[PDB]
Structure formats: structure tokens, C-alpha cells
């Protein structure tokens, strides 16, 4: 594989159509899904030349841990849909690559089993029916060694997935929510923040004042995101809000972004717009479907090579230097 | 049906081509018809997160009545062209859905029969040869229980419908103007305003100063509209004038918009740009052609679900909150 | 024919390919040819409503004469290429329609014969080898009753017509320059201005300061034009310079525009951007090729109907009102 | 050949696919490769009329020598890949056309042999493992009569050429680096500047402050360039940075540009944006592949004719006048 696009083909070949559609699809007309890519393709980097590249490093420190790349694996529910080893395969490859892995509330392997793999696990929280059971998942995650709580805030309910509706898609009986819902509010965030010493990261922020409020609320990070175009159809891409959000929080929390990151060059664009790190979702599942743990390993090695390549070609010996790059929007 | 686009296909299958063309077409090169859709697709919403959604309501109060959605059925002439029950089928479904229905001057069932269905009927006025007969239609409408007069102001004459001209389209003899024309001016508006206690709504306003003058003239509302691209070919889409018009009237009248609204997400966009409500035209006729009253019921249920979905995903418990959303224009 | 596009098809059918290419083509990659259309399609009009349309008139006064439309037939060389009656057919139809006709220096019928048709003939000048012979053409034109000299200023030499080069196109022996070249300068303009009492109109102005200088030089008009994309490939469309040019000359001369005008709606756009009038080139030749004098008559009747339609739908009882319309650029 | 596009076809026919791909391709997704063309196509020139064109000249003085056009042949490695005479064929044609030829560090004929052809040779430097051997190439070039050192600064390493990777492309054994690498820094530039009296030209500058620093560092010129989209995928096109760079250096060095120049009109655009001259890469190799030295001669004659044509049509008797043209960005 010489690009991430190589893996999507392989995944399309092996996966049942309705499962590929569950993975690929978005809500409504998929306007926001498409816009995530459009928006990245309009960004051009202004590279710097003639700088010292003797020790280029793609490493970052985030939420108290070194990561090998400014990247984590996005939360993706029910990974056994894509390969029999599901979350274990992905978590093992992420660990070996030095990349944080986000364990889902709706994981198809229990969070404790996935955490036992080691590495840098984060835990993604969906708010439950009750504060006490929500906080129990959080406590489980913390007890198991997860190092951040990624509280997803853009799913008061699931968006309208028309591919799933037309396919009559349902979870096969051989996939379960192995850790076993209500709309979250700012009160829910405070309940979580008070219940853990772990950094709380709010995933799904797009409005500048919600980013500001996240910092005021004690969040250690946010993910600027429209949930891969799966939630509000017509939601602005995170990448188009990122610069304004980074300016507004002025270093008060980590600012991650996701949606359509498909190469090391895309990681560089995100960094140049001010992101601390990116999440990558669908491509990690393509790699998992295509070739299991080894597939995910190959994807992460490819991404690592592309990130180093893009950084050096842009004159950046560190991710902090890449954040100081300027950009120019094209057509 | 999981989207409005499902219904257009069914309508295309059942309707005679020249009738489908009468419905689908625009004037001239159909530049304004296409631009209505382009313009909506360029609008992205910036959703808010973590707000209280315990009692999301899509209801609005407009022209003295509660409506179930920020939506009314647009005036569409000669609905028996599309189904034998014509206006009665549509009016019944609108009533049952809690949506206002606009009875046309050129209705193929008399305005009194359609009003007898109940619900929230509005009446759309085309200015006639003479002030006295124009005012008679208005008086008929008011006597029959219509609750607003939608005075169409962008048809001094009918636009050049090239599909109709190439098809040699004419009303079949089995369709008549069951209520049975000159250019309207501001004097005509005043004649109507003086003749009724009902709110007068000027449909087809695009210039900011015409919106201002509408308020000065005593209009209770305007519809920002290029008549679905059927009148001036090259007229700006209403959605591209809406924000500027809403700012200029500064609460002095209701500001509705139409043209290309095809989903609950589109309703949300219109609301976020400042609209009080939208009108929906062609899709209601697709539903009527495809499946009569039941078809229109299904369309309105779908739209209601999509509007509630979009509002909640955008953090809006009410339509007023949706009007306070920000937007960002894309490419 | 219900549109100008109807006629192009007919012309394509009847004309030898190399002659159709001579007519349709532009210079270089035809970037400017295409951009003339792109640019018009991006312009949207903001129509006014509810104005008095009791006596809508499309007439204008220009260069001392009433014209039936804000339009003239552009200079097009060698019209016998397209029909045996050539310039006589076009001039007769223009006369009957009340539209000025521009007689070319490179006409295939002598300027005196074409002037004898009557109507409102203008004369287009290409600067010759010598001042004295140039001025002789001007004097011939004036003696024959031409009412303006349209001095073409964007052809120091003919552009690179790659269609013509690939076709090995040459004038057939049955077409001649019946009135029988060096780069023109501002000195040439002054020589012409001093030699005639007729208004001198500079055709091919695109730079704002060249428009200003044209007024200073005593021009009665300019045509803002990139010569239909036939001269500099990459020249900005006239329609994209028009508003800035109209503002800069501030009523000091008539400002016409051409390039891609293909409907009455396009005439309205040009007027709303500030043009006094438009020229129309290729469509008049399509009509000539398709059906001779009668074809040109039909085209001009169609354009007249479309101009009246567009004006009234936009709330304009006169061309001066249409010049006060606002516009909004789309995508 | 009536355009540069004629030659690409011929080259595609004759060259082995993997060699055509080596020539045509870019890095990554080829976003920057495509953007070079997009960016040029969006630029429109505002031509001037009625100026004296009695002695139009396309000549410029640059780096102490007259050149026949504001153009040089870009450095392209390993030209024997495209024709058996390789660099000798191209250098001979460039000499005969009065165009500088850039001899590459990775030339497939020795720099001394190519310099012996005569003409105006420049020498392109890739920084080597060691300062002393780097400076030896520079000294060789100067001894052999090269008149500028074009130090390529955007290749700390070669970009990711996915076409080459998928083709498994490697140099055939019949092509060698006949003159026989580490990342260059500003220290390397100073080492070169101190080692030669020749002007040093930094090729691959895109950031405005790198252009400023180039002048401060004693560079005689820069080439604003993204290396033909072959280095950082997502790097902004040089043509989109050119105007800002020209303003920032304020005459302190020559500012060249390359990337996608494919006609005399493109040369005019570059000049109007402020370039001193352009480089042309791939088209020169198309001509070489198609027809050897004679092919390159034909290409340069065509470009010369197109440049003269574009300049005169734009009212420019000199390249300095063309630099004073205004432009307008289109869609
Ligand atoms: C199949 C699938 C399942 C997902 N499940 C979750 C989830 O359980 N929790 C969550 O916060 N995001 C979930 N996401 C959203 C991703 O974390 C991410 O925001 C999105 O995929 C955008 O990134 P991408 O374009 O790289 O896929 C899911 C996305 C996909 C495609
Ligand atoms: C077939 C058809 C008939 C219409 N008849 C009327 C009419 O009688 N009066 C009126 O004011 N608008 C009329 N309209 C315009 C609509 O009210 C509305 O402005 C337009 O269709 C744009 O909305 P849409 O894109 O949702 O169809 C008609 C539209 C269509 C398509
Ligand atoms: C076949 C042809 C011949 C033309 N001959 C002349 C000419 O002799 N003199 C002139 O000033 N313009 C000439 N023009 C330019 C036109 O007057 C006009 O500027 C151009 O066609 C743009 O208008 P259009 O898009 O309506 O064709 C010619 C154009 C065409 C297509
Ligand atoms: C096959 C090929 C080889 C090249 N080799 C070199 C090189 O050795 N040194 C260099 O500075 N640029 C090299 N370049 C870049 C060119 O000098 C130039 O920047 C680029 O091709 C953009 O111009 P174009 O679009 O006219 O090809 C090469 C380009 C190509 C296509
Ligand atoms: O985007 C997703 O699929 C998840 O975030 C979800 F939580 F919304 C979800 C999980 C499982 C099935 C449908 C939606
Ligand atoms: O857009 C429409 O079709 C109506 O608004 C109309 F009034 F213009 C009309 C009604 C019937 C036939 C043609 C136009
Ligand atoms: O655009 C044109 O064809 C004319 O304006 C011309 F004068 F340039 C010309 C006339 C006849 C043949 C080629 C060009
Ligand atoms: O763009 C290029 O091909 C050259 O500039 C290069 F130096 F990068 C190079 C030369 C030979 C093989 C691969 C890259």
C-alpha cells in the first residue's frame, strides 16, 4: 500500500455491502461527509525551506503521554463488524505504532480486554440513561488504565443514516455491545469532570463559543468534528472551524480535529491550521477489514512515513514548527 | 420514503411528461431554478452542543395560529393536474399535519371547498383586471375562513416557460380555474390591506428595499422568493437575499423563504439564516402525484421528523433557538 | 425558435465545418471565449416588484438615434461566409427590427450597398497601412449615411485562431473584401476624431484607464469587450470590467459591452451592470446561416420579446430603470 | 505544432509508460500538480490598447546576459531518459533560440559537455553529503562557463512519487549521473555564495519570508516554485505566491516562477503578476521525446511566437510593460 486509498478498495471487496455502507456512509444527503474532503482539498500549505532537519521528529506530548505521531485512532463502534479480532487487532497495532487508541462505549470487545493490550488507551463515553451508570463506565475506564475520557457531545441521538435505512442494516447477532442512552448537557460534562482526574476531551465541538465554554468547563481537550458527516447533515466541517477555534481557546486546551484525514499531508494541513493532533476513523477500519492487525500496522507505518515526509518537505523539524506554518485557501 | 428525492422518482413515473415538465420546469435557461439548489447546498450550519433537549418543539406561532412546523405548503396552481383529488388531498394532509395550506387563486377546486376541509388555510391572490373583482376574491377567502392573504407580487405576467413552449403544454379540458389578470403595484397592496383585517403577505420579494417598503406598507409578512425559478431567469435565489432582508426589516414582519427546500436540514438552514418559516412547493406535488393524500401525509411526516432531527442535532429546543444559529458559506 | 440556442444547432448543421469553426472559435485555448459565458452566468439580478409597467419600453436613444432595443448587431467580417445574401440579409432584418447594424471594414458586400438598405448603420473601422486611406473609409462611411464610427482597437494584428490553423482555413474565392492594415494608436483615434463629426466608439476597451482615456480623447462611446475571446487568450471578459468602467467614466460616454450575450436576460444583466447597450455577434450569424434574412428577423423578435419580459419581471418600465437594478455574483 | 498540448500527445506515444509517468507525475495525490494549472487558468489579464507596437521585443536582461524571451529551460534530471541525445539536444536548441538552459547536477551528460554547446548555460545544484564536494560542482560549473548557480532548496529529500512507486520505476542502466546528497540549509547557501562570483538563484521558494531572507542572504534571484507538484503534495502553487513575493522583495533580486507554464499567454500572466522570467520543464521534455533537438527548436519557436503575440495584443512593447499589466482572478 502506497496510499490510504489502496486500502479502501480492499475493504470494499471483502466486506458485506451493508457493513461497508455502515462504515462509509453519512447522514442525510451526505453533504457534510463530502464537505470534509472538499474542505481539506482546498487547503494549501506554504512550506518553509532551508531549515535544520537533522532530527525531524513527529512526536508530541498529549494528555501526559508521548505519542509517536500527532494522531490517534478515532472511536469507531463495533469493530468486530470489520474483522473477527475487532478492537483487539486495532489496539495492538496502535500500541505497536505508539499511537493512542480510543476504546468505545459501544466496543464489541470489553474495554478491560482492550485496555489489557497496553499502549495508550483513551476511552470514549456516550452518556447513558443515568448519571450513576455513566460515571461507572468512566470509573471502569480509569481503573483499567485509560488515560483520557473522550466525551462525545454531538450525539444526543444517532443521525439519520439513509444507507442504513435503505439496507435495513442491523447489528448481526454475532456482534454485541461488550461493555454492557440520553442527551448529554454541560451538567453531564461537569459530572464527568468531577468524577475523574483524567483529562476530559469533548468530541464534536464546532461552534467557537462551545470551544470557549469547553475550556471554561475544565476540558483538557476538544475534538473539532462533525462526526464524519454522520450526525447533522449540513454541519460545517471541523477543518473549516479549526483556525477560529484555535485562536479562541488560546492554548487553554488541546484542540484536535477529525473528518477526512487521509494522508500525512492532511495531517500537516490540520497541524498548520493549529491542531494539536488529528483523529483518523474510516481508514483504520479499511486496514482492519483488509488485513487485520497487520493491515492496521501497515496503515500506521504508511501514515508515519507520510507525516515525516510532509513535515520535512515543509521545513518542520517538529510538530510545533508545523503548527506555525501558514496556509492559503484554494479553489 | 426516507427522503424527498424518493418521491420525485415516483412522480416522474406516473405523470404525463408534459405535466411533469410543467411542475419541474423554470423560465429561460433555468439558471434560477438550479441556483436555488446551489445556494442551499453552499450553506453550512454551525451546530451547538450540550443544550437541554428535553422538550424539543418544532412549533411556531405565525399569523395568529400555531403551526406544527416552520413550514407551509406553497401555492401551486391547478393541483388536479397531479392527482384526481387535487387540492382536497393536499389540504387534508396539511390539516392533519398541522401545516398551513395555501389555497391558490388558480385552484382547480373552489377555495370554499378547500377551506371546508379545515386546518389553517391561507389564500394566495393574483391581481385581477379590476380592483373590485380582486377584492371579491379576497372577501371570499376571508368569509371562508382563510387566515392570511398571500399576495403574489412577482408575476406581472407569467415567465417564459420553455419546457411548456416546446411541449405545447396547455391545461387539459378536465382541469379548470374553479374560482372563476393585471400587474400588481403598491397601490394594489394598499387596496388589499384596506379591504381585509387578515395579514397580507407579499410573496416574491427579493430586493432589500422592497422588503422594507413591504413593512412600511403594512404587510404582515413577506416570502423571499424567485418563484421557484419560474419567473425572471437570472433572479437571485431568495436564500441568498434572506439574511440581508431579515436584518433590514428588524422584526417588522414575518420573513418566509422558499425555493428548493428539500429536507429538514434545508429548513434548518433557512431558519438559521433568519426565516420565520419556509414554503415547500414541488415536493408536495411529487407526493400528491405519487400517492395522493397518503403520499402528502408521508412527506409531511418525513419532513417533520427531519426538522426535529436537525434541530436537536444542532442544539435547538425551539425554532427561535434555530434562528440564532450561525452559518458558514462553503464551496 | 424559443431560444438563441435553437439557432446554433441549425447553423452547425448547414455550415461547412471550417466555416462554423471560424465563427465559433476563439484564440489560443479559448479560455476567454468560455469565460465570457461563465462570467455572465455568475451574475444574478435583484428584481424590483410592484412598479408601474403600463408602458414598458425597451427603446433607447444612442448616438443621436432611437433604437428599439439596447442592442446593436456586432461587426462580423465576411458575412457571405454564412449565407449568400450576407450583410444585406442581416442589415435588412436589423433595419426592420429597429436595431443598429455595424457595417464592417471587411464586409463581403460594399459599405455603400449595405448602407443603401437604410436603417441605422454604423461603420466599424480597422486601421489601414496609411492614415489617408483609413480616413477615406471613414469619409465613405459618413457620406453613405453611417451614424457612428466603431473603431476596433484590440486588433493590432489578428489573434491566434487554432481552429483556423488546424483546419487550414482560408477565405473561399467567392468571398471578397468588397470595400477594397497597421496597429492603431491614440494618435490614430485623434486622426479619426478630427476627420468626422460622427461619434467615435472605441471597441475592445478592457482597462479602466483606457476607458478614462477614451473619454478624454473625445470618444462618444466604448465597447467593453475581449473580441469574443478571439484576440488575447486570457483577456478578462468585458462583463467583469463593465461596472468598474461605468463608474470611472461617470457618464462621459456611452458604455457598451459584448461577449456571450445570448438572451434578453443577458441583456438585462449587462444593463444592470451599467451598460448603455450590448452588441450581439455569433447568434446573429447563426440565424443568418440557418434561415437568411427571415432567420435574423426571428432572432431579433425573440430577443425583443425576451428583453421586454426580463425588464418587466424585474420591475423596469425603461432601460434607465434597468441600469439602476442591483446584482449579486453567484457561484 | 500549433500549441504545447500537441507535443504531449506525441511524447505519450513514443515514451515507455513508466518514463512518461516519471515525467508527468507529482507527489502524493498530485494535488499540487493539478493546482499549478488551476491557478494559472484562474488568472485573467487586463490588456492595454492603442500603444506603440512598432518595435515589440520579448528580450530581457537577466544575470548579466540578454535572453531572447523571459524564459529559461527548467532543470530536468536525466534527459537521456527521453531521447538518446538528451541534454545535448535540448541545450543546442536553447542556445539557438537565445534561451538559457539549466544544466542539472543529475544530468545524464556531463556538465562540461553540455556547457561546450555554448549558449547561456546555468547550473542547477543539489547539495551533496559534504560542503567540499558541493562546492566542487559549483567550481566545475563556473570553470565551464555557467553563468548562474540555481541552488534547488525544496528537496531535502525526494518527494513521494506514487506513480514511480507503483511502476517500480528505476533508472535504466543506460542512463547515468554523468557528473559523478544532504538537506541544504541557509548555511549551505552562504557557503555557495562565498565560493562563487556567479549569481546564486534559490529555486523552490514559496514563503514570503523565505523570499525576503533570500535577498538578505545575497541571492541574485529566486524561483517561486513547488517543484512542479513533485515535492510537498499540498504545497501552494508558486503562481499564487508570486505577487506577494514580488512586492516583498521590492526589486532586491530577480523573481522567477515555474509550474504549469504551457503557452505564451501563461508567460504573459506570470509577467503581469511580477515575474522576471519563467522556467518551463515538462513541455521541453515532450518536445525532446517527440522529435529531439528539432522538436525542442519547434517548441521554443512556438513559445516565442505566442509570447510576442500575447504581449502585443496586451499593448506591451517590452517585458517591463507586461510586468505593469493588471490582472483579475476569475472562477
Ligand atoms: C463506523 C463508524 C463508527 C463510529 N463510531 C463512533 C463512536 O462510537 N463514537 C464516536 O464518538 N464517534 C464515532 N465515529 C466517528 C469517528 O470517531 C470520527 O469522528 C469520524 O469517523 C470522522 O473521521 P473519518 O473521516 O476519519 O472517518 C464513528 C465513525 C464511523 C465511520
Ligand atoms: C407547478 C407550480 C405552480 C405554481 N403556482 C403558483 C401560484 O399559482 N401562485 C404562486 O404564488 N406561486 C406558484 N408557484 C410557486 C411556488 O409557490 C413556489 O414559490 C416555488 O415552487 C418555489 O418552491 P419549490 O422549489 O419548493 O417548488 C408554483 C410553482 C409550481 C412549481
Ligand atoms: C466570425 C467573427 C467575425 C468578427 N469580425 C469582427 C470584425 O471584423 N470587427 C470587429 O470589430 N469585431 C469582429 N468580431 C467581434 C465581434 O464584433 C464581437 O466583439 C464578438 O463576436 C463577441 O460577441 P459574441 O459573443 O456575441 O459573438 C467578429 C466576431 C466573429 C465571431
Ligand atoms: C522529470 C523532471 C525532473 C526534474 N528534475 C529536476 C532537477 O533535477 N532539479 C530541479 O531543481 N528541478 C527538477 N525538476 C523540476 C523542474 O525544474 C520544474 O520546477 C517543474 O517541472 C515545474 O515546471 P513544469 O510544470 O513546467 O514542468 C524536474 C521536473 C521534472 C518533471
Ligand atoms: O457514528 C456512529 O455510527 C456511532 O458514533 C453511533 F454511536 F452513532 C452509532 C453506533 C452504532 C450504530 C449506529 C450509530
Ligand atoms: O408558476 C406558475 O406556474 C404559476 O404561479 C403561474 F401563475 F404563473 C401559472 C399558472 C398556470 C399556468 C402557468 C403559470
Ligand atoms: O475576429 C475576427 O475574425 C475579425 O475581427 C478579424 F478582423 F480579426 C478577422 C477577419 C477575417 C479573418 C480573420 C480575422
Ligand atoms: O523532481 C525530480 O524528479 C528531481 O528534481 C529529483 F531530483 F527529485 C529526482 C531526480 C531523479 C529521480 C527522482 C527525483
Which key features would you list for this structure?
binds flavin mononucleotide; alpha/beta; homotetramer; Alpha-hydoxy_acid_DH_FMN (chains A, B, C, D); Aldolase_TIM (chains A, B, C, D); 4-hydroxymandelate oxidase (chains A, B, C, D); 331 residues; EC 1.1.3.46 (chains A, B, C, D); FMN-dep_DH (chains A, B, C, D); binds (2R)-3,3-difluoro-2-hydroxy-3-phenylpropanoic acid; TIM Barrel
Indicate the topology.
4 copies of one chain form a homotetramer.
Chain A: H1 4-14, H2 17-24, H3 31-41, E1 43-46, E2 60-62, E3 65-67, E4 71-73, H4 86-97, E5 101-104, H5 111-116, E6 121-125, H6 131-143, E7 149-152, H7 162-167, H8 186-195, E8 200-205, H9 208-216, E9 221-224, H10 238-249, E10 254-257, H11 264-272, E11 277-280, H12 282-313, H13 319-323, E12 326-329
Parallel strand pairs in A: 4-11, 5-6, 6-7, 7-8, 8-9, 9-10, 10-11
Antiparallel strand pairs in A: 1-12, 2-3
Bound molecules: flavin mononucleotide (FMN) (4 copies) and (2R)-3,3-difluoro-2-hydroxy-3-phenylpropanoic acid (4 copies).
Residues 22-23, 36, 74-77, 104, 106, 124, 152, 203, 225, 227-228, 230, 258-261, 279-282 of chain A line the site of one flavin mononucleotide.
Q: Measure the end-to-end span of chain A.
A: 29 Å
Q: Give the strand order of the largest sheet of chain A, numbering strands 1, 2, ... along the chain.
A: 4-11-10-9-8-7-6-5
Order of helices and strands of chain A: HHHEEEEHEHEHEHHEHEHEHEHHE
Percent of residues in helices of chain A: 40-55%
Heteromolecules bound: flavin mononucleotide, (2R)-3,3-difluoro-2-hydroxy-3-phenylpropanoic acid
Strand tally of chain A is 12
Classified in CATH, the superfamily of chain A is Aldolase class I
What kind of assembly state do the chains in view correspond to? Answer: homotetramer
Instruction: Write down the overall geometry of chain A.
Output: globular
**Could you name the CATH topology of chain A?**
TIM Barrel
The structural class of chain A is alpha/beta
Beta-strand share of residues of chain A: 5-15%
The overall number of domains of chain A is 1
Q: Major β-sheet of chain A, in short?
A: 8 strands, parallel
Q: From the coordinates shown, what is the CATH architecture of chain A?
A: Alpha-Beta Barrel
Q: Assign the CATH class of chain A.
A: Alpha Beta
| Rg measurement of chain A, Å | 18 Å
Largest interface: A-B, 39 and 31 residues
| Tally of contiguous helical segments of chain A | 13
